[PDB]
Amino acid sequence: SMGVRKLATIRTAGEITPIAGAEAIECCHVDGWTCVIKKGEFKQGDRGVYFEIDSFIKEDNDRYPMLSKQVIDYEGQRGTRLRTARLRGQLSQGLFLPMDRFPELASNQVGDDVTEILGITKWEPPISTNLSGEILGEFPTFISKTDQERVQNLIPQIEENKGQKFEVTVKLDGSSMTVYRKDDHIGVCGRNWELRETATNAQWHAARRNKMIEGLQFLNRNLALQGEIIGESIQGNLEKLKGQDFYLFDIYDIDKAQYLTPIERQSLVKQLNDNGFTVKHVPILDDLELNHTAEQILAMADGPSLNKNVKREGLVFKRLDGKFSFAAISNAYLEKHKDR
Ligand SMILES: Nc1ncnc2c1ncn2[C@@H]1O[C@H](COP(=O)(O)OP(=O)(O)OP(=O)(O)O)[C@@H](O)[C@H]1O
Ligand SMILES: [Mn+2]
Ligand SMILES: [Mn+2]
Ligand SMILES: [Mn+2]
């Protein structure tokens, strides 16, 4: 998905195959996903509404009776969190429903995002106190969010980018943080909002400890430093840090409205650190020239994290021109850490 967008989309049923023994269900490929459907629901080529994992579907027995015994109470409301599943060891991800359940979507084309009209939201794990700040204002409209699309949703784009080169980085499991300068203002943001400085806010504390506000003034440009804050009290602290710290993965050029290329970003990190502004960067793996299937890419996702004895959330791929990127999440990670 793209943040809170594209949780529910119109998609085309792919290859459908029988499931061993179970006479009432079958396996349906939907883009790079596989999920269990009931017999009678689809033939290959049919449209359906595909709800991606992490969708939260509020209880509705008329529309979603197949979820009635999967409901939890989440943020004060009964509904179902879609999660990675297995049936006799076979991977199933997401929910694929045929169009007869959605007569009001009959004019929607393949590719349409129907998240809002269906009221689908994204499930999120609990956030610790110091990662929720005093809201200064909106996330700046002149800075891109840090959302990354999943490789499973990019099958044609993977072929379109055959032969292109990518920076491969470890996907750290923390919270997205943006520190930016635009003319006479420097701000600190979390995932969704710009935050006021307080003595206990974790994003501001990380920005202050690494001097990245003075670093932005030194660079004297309109830039957004975007990174992951990880460590104690954040997302289970996979890396076993003491304390917290910021790990850069992108720099947004505000005036040009584009990301710096990986090489441009490496040079700015070097300039920052060489001048006393200690900014760390997410782990960088070998570059990849793309000549791969989604399946091969997903088989790259598991591996050592920043802490090499823990298994990483996955990988992010950023094309060397800065203009195309995606994430490959480790399915083993999704099945191991079921509470986030
Ligand atoms: N190396 C990296 N490159 C880019 N993003 C990264 C990297 N490491 C961690 N991240 C985080 O991964 C996110 C992109 O993945 P995605 O869009 O799936 O969000 P997410 O991790 O599910 O969101 P959240 O955990 O905030 O709910 C970024 O918003 C950023 O917080
Ligand atoms: Mn995600
Ligand atoms: Mn999330
Ligand atoms: Mn995350």
Side-chain angles (χ1 to χ4, degrees):
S1 60
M2 283 298 280
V4 302
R5 301 187 297 109
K6 308 191 176 174
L7 304 176
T9 54
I10 308 301
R11 308 205 189 195
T12 298
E15 292 283 283
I16 298 172
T17 54
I19 289 176
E23 200 68 340
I25 51 163
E26 41 198 6
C27 189
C28 188
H29 288 197
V30 182
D31 296 334
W33 304 103
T34 61
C35 70
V36 179
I37 55 171
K38 315 295 179 72
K39 293 196 132 202
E41 283 179 339
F42 292 101
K43 294 294 144 149
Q44 177 167 9
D46 289 351
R47 285 178 306 145
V49 184
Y50 182 71
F51 303 83
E52 206 167 284
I53 56 174
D54 309 326
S55 297
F56 185 71
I57 305 179
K58 287 179 200 195
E59 187 169 48
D60 178 348
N61 254 278
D62 293 327
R63 182 105 81 179
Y64 308 106
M66 72 294 297
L67 308 175
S68 67
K69 310 301 174 134
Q70 294 171 70
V71 165
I72 60 175
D73 197 282
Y74 171 65
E75 292 197 355
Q77 287 197 298
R78 278 176 62 88
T80 300
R81 173 198 178 193
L82 298 188
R83 267 205 69 242
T84 301
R86 272 184 205 268
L87 191 83
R88 286 175 146 235
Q90 297 294 101
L91 183 74
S92 183
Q93 287 167 314
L95 174 68
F96 195 36
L97 293 180
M99 296 310 298
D100 46 278
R101 295 212 172 259
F102 309 93
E104 74 273 13
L105 307 183
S107 312
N108 286 103
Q109 311 281 116
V110 170
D112 282 3
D113 184 0
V114 293
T115 300
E116 283 188 285
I117 194 169
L118 301 179
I120 307 304
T121 52
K122 191 156 200 126
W123 182 94
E124 299 294 340
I127 295 179
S128 71
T129 302
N130 293 340
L131 277 292
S132 52
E134 306 280 355
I135 306 310
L136 174 62
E138 69 187 355
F139 196 92
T141 61
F142 50 83
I143 300 165
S144 174
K145 299 285 257 288
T146 58
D147 311 305
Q148 294 286 345
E149 185 56 88
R150 294 181 200 250
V151 65
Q152 292 95 328
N153 299 317
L154 294 167
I155 306 306
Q157 287 75 23
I158 293 314
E159 281 267 10
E160 193 184 16
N161 279 266
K162 185 178 178 55
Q164 291 294 297
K165 293 163 302 151
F166 292 79
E167 175 199 64
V168 181
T169 49
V170 172
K171 195 172 191 290
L172 297 182
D173 191 349
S175 194
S176 177
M177 160 178 170
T178 296
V179 188
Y180 76 97
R181 179 186 184 275
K182 183 177 159 51
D183 302 324
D184 59 342
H185 179 83
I186 294 192
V188 174
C189 311
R191 320 162 44 175
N192 298 305
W193 303 103
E194 179 156 357
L195 306 173
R196 301 195 184 268
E197 182 170 18
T198 68
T200 58
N201 177 247
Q203 293 94 332
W204 272 97
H205 185 246
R208 290 304 192 184
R209 195 173 28 82
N210 72 355
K211 297 278 313 281
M212 58 200 299
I213 295 164
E214 287 93 339
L216 280 160
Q217 293 291 26
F218 156 77
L219 290 181
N220 195 37
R221 293 174 60 188
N222 291 344
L223 301 169
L225 310 175
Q226 299 189 301
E228 196 81 342
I229 181 170
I230 59 158
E232 294 186 84
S233 309
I234 301 174
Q235 285 290 82
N237 188 16
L238 183 80
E239 312 298 344
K240 305 173 181 164
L241 291 191
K242 211 281 154 203
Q244 303 165 343
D245 215 344
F246 171 90
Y247 290 79
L248 188 83
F249 51 70
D250 256 322
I251 301 179
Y252 195 69
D253 188 324
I254 288 170
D255 291 354
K256 294 191 200 214
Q258 66 195 12
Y259 280 103
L260 295 210
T261 67
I263 207 87
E264 288 166 342
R265 161 160 41 78
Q266 293 323 291
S267 174
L268 285 199
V269 178
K270 176 173 166 55
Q271 290 177 59
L272 281 168
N273 280 282
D274 289 352
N275 283 274
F277 309 103
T278 62
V279 59
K280 298 186 178 191
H281 198 287
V282 294
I284 303 167
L285 303 194
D286 293 340
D287 281 5
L288 183 97
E289 186 180 305
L290 191 53
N291 290 291
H292 296 76
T293 63
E295 177 184 26
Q296 290 173 305
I297 293 168
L298 288 169
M300 306 174 200
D302 186 41
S305 194
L306 174 71
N307 183 325
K308 77 174 186 64
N309 277 20
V310 310
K311 288 294 211 294
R312 65 194 173 217
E313 182 191 347
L315 298 172
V316 181
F317 295 77
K318 300 181 189 70
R319 201 167 73 185
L320 289 198
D321 65 356
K323 298 184 187 316
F324 174 66
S325 63
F326 59 92
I329 305 303
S330 167
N331 282 324
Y333 195 91
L334 297 181
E335 303 181 71
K336 174 176 181 57
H337 306 291
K338 295 175 188 299
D339 294 312
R340 62 184 185 263

